[PDB]
A paper describes a structure:
To understand the structure and function of the [name] eut bacterial microcompartment we have determined the crystal structures of two proteins with homology to BMC shell proteins, CD1908 and CD1918, and show that they are well conserved between species. We have also determined the atomic structure of CD1925, a member of the [name] family of cupin barrels. The sequestration of ethanolamine metabolism within a BMC is thought to protect the cell from the acetaldehyde produced as an intermediate in its breakdown and to prevent the loss of this volatile compound and its carbon from the cell.
The crystal structure of a CD1925 variant, truncated at the N-terminus by 16 amino acids (CD1925(17–157)), was solved by molecular replacement and determined to 1 Å resolution. Two chains were present in the asymmetric unit, with residues 28–153 visible in chain A and 29–157 visible in chain B, with the majority of the C-terminal His6 tag also visible in the latter chain. The protein belongs to the [name] family of cupins and has the distinct β-barrel fold associated with these proteins. The two chains in the asymmetric unit form a dimer, with a total interface area of 1740 Å2 out of 9285 Å2 total surface area for each monomer. This dimer interface is formed between one face of the β-barrel of each monomer, with an interaction between β9 of one monomer and β2 of the partner chain, thus extending the β-sheet across the two molecules. The surface of CD1925 does not display the distinctive charge distribution patterns seen for the oligomeric BMC proteins CD1908 and CD1918; instead its surface has irregular patches of positive and negative electrostatic potential. A shallow, negatively charged cleft is visible on the surface of each protein chain within the cupin β-barrel, this cleft corresponds to the region that coordinates divalent cations and acts as the active site in the metal binding cupins, such as those with sugar isomerase activity. In contrast to the metal-binding catalytic cupins, CD1925 and the [name] family, do not possess the histidine residues that are responsible for metal coordination in the oxidoreductase and epimerase classes of cupins. In the place of the histidine residues are aromatic (Trp94) and hydrophobic residues (Leu 96, Ile134) and in the fourth position a glutamic acid residue (Glu100), which is also present in the cupins with epimerase activity. The glutamic acid (Glu100) is within hydrogen bonding distance of an aspartic acid residue (Asp102), which may act to alter its pKa. Because of strong sequence conservation seen in this area for the [name] family and the fact that this region is solvent accessible and it corresponds with the position of the catalytic site of other cupins, this region may act to bind ligands, or act as a catalytic centre (starred residues).
Author numbering:
A (entry chain A): 28 to 153
B (entry chain B): 29 to 165
Write the structure that this text describes.
């Protein structure tokens, strides 16, 4: 396969992914503008594979950063704790919980310790 | 009011404690076969989430036919979900993911049991039909 994780990509495009085999690396580092931030985003589907829904793996360690979303997002927290700071308020999810974030939200992704989560977005392509 | 634990912020940003999401008979999908056991519980109204649909699905000892004229991502929490497409099988168990592109004619096949989150586009997946509604009038 041409990816570095384990999947079964069927002829039809239907795909299973063994998510524990998805490992982030430095090519997935997100530039927040602050080089000390440690944030990884690893898209799991090309646009050709999934033209409408985006889906990837995000990991953060001891980092809080500002970001504005151009898309709707569902985050399913696999491990750790993710805090979302919005307008001075906090919304949090730990392992096995989810967060929905509407398009246009001006947030901080805030991870005092560690978090690993799937993100599903719409649209995949701006 | 909903029957699960969530924090719905003023901004629309919402956390959900998914283990508190319990399916009930109000969520039972009538497949046509009375012995089938399928539950679908949407977790967001259209006003809450106008583009992404998201809910909890459970199945037990059931396989049924479905055509998805919408895209779907499933995260399998417990059990095993099989997707049968053109005589082939794609499977995900606890901790694994499935993507189903729009236009897929499948069987959802759960000979054992499965509990999974689904995320769809468009949001109102159950109205992606000629009737524009969840049930035929
Ligand atoms: Mg064929």
């Amino acid at each position: 396969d041409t990816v570095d994780f384990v999947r079964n990509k069927d002829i039809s495009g239907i795909t299973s992914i063994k998510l524990p085999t998805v490992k982030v690396s430095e090519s997935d580092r997100l530039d927040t503008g602050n080089p000390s931030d440690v944030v990884y985003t690893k898209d799991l589907f090309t646009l050709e594979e999934s033209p409408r829904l985006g889906c990837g793996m995000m990991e953060m360690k001891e980092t809080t950063f500002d970001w504005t979303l151009n898309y709707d997002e569902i985050d399913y927290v696999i491990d750790g704790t993710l805090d979302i700071i919005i307008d001075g308020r906090k919304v949090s999810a730990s392992s096995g919980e989810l967060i929905f974030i509407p398009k246009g939200s001006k947030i901080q992704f805030s991870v005092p310790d560690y978090a690993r989560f799937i993100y599903v977005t719409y649209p995949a392509d701006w």
